[PDB]
Structure formats: structure tokens, C-alpha cells
Amino acid sequence: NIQGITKPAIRRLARRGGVKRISGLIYEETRGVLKVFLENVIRDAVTYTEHAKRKTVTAMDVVYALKRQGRTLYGFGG
């Protein structure tokens, strides 16, 4: 599941980030960091959705979650 974030996808992300050479343990470290970030953001989004008494996590819940974390995103009904 978490391994579904493929090693080459991480290389592509790093390449867009300007990285030339990548270490082996990097990929696992990035999987962990992405896991933590998604955990926090989804936790806030769920908190919002639960407070909305809805069984569907909506995009506005996600946007509010990133707004809380100081990671504001545009293009999804801000």
C-alpha cells in the first residue's frame, strides 16, 4: 500500500525538485515523510467531516485542513 508510492515516482518528484543524485534510503525516508504529512492533513480533514456529520470527506474539508497547517492550496473552491 504505502509501497505503492514507487521509487521512480519519488525520483520524478526529486527531479522536479532539482535533485541530480539520489540515495537508496531516501525513498523509504520520503515514504515515511509523506505518510506523516498525509496522516496530519487527513486527520484534520476527517475532524472537519465528522463535525459536518457527513460520511463523505469533501474537498473543502481538505482545503480547510491545509489552511490550518499553513499550506494553503488554490484551485478547489478556496
Binding site: R16, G18, T72, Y74, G75
Partner: protein, 103 residues
């Protein structure tokens, strides 16, 4: 309308209504919606100006988000304003570190 009375293209009535129901204060003045609408209208005017410039540079007639990202990040002041904002499908500026370049 009042945007006509203020020479503005943004709706003064909407911003006044939003200021009221946005529980920002118990009472709201008259000039405040006009001033605020003007500020927003210029800010988007600057954004659209630079985005259209970038689209012309990329030889496109319709502005796509990448143009917006280029306009914001290339401009130092707009980049500072949107310092904690990620623009969807915005991408990143082309930037390669010197030591990474071939010798």
C-alpha cells in the same frame, strides 16, 4: 450600482454583504466595502497582467495555471505575498544548481 459610482469592476454590494456576515465587526462603515473592492480589483489586475504576459511568452491565448505560477514566482513581491500558497498544476520555476551542471 455602486461599483459604477466607484469606478470599480468588482461588486461593492457583495463585499459589503460578506463583510457583514463574515462576523468581522458588529458594524461596518460605508467606505470600507469600496476601498476593499478596489484593493482586490487591483491585486487581481496585477496578477492577470503578469499572467497574460507569461501566456504571451508561452504563446498561448488562454491563461492556464502554469502562467499564474510563473507570474507569481517570478515577481518577488507577489511571491512574497503568496509565500504559503501552493498553486495546483502550477509547477516550479526552471532552476538548476551550478555544481550540478556539467563541466
Amino acid at each position: 450600482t455602486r461599483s459604477s459610482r466607484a469606478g470599480l469592476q468588482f461588486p461593492v454590494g457583495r463585499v459589503h454583504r460578506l463583510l457583514r456576515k463574515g462576523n468581522y465587526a458588529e458594524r461596518v462603515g460605508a467606505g470600507a466595502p469600496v476601498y476593499l473592492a478596489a484593493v482586490l480589483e487591483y491585486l487581481t489586475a496585477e496578477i492577470l497582467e503578469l499572467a497574460g504576459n507569461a501566456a504571451r511568452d508561452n504563446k498561448k491565448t488562454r491563461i492556464i495555471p502554469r502562467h499564474l505560477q510563473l507570474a507569481v514566482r517570478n515577481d518577488e513581491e507577489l511571491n512574497k505575498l503568496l509565500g504559503r500558497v501552493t498553486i495546483a498544476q502550477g509547477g516550479v520555476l526552471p532552476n538548476i544548481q551550478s555544481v550540478l551542471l556539467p563541466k
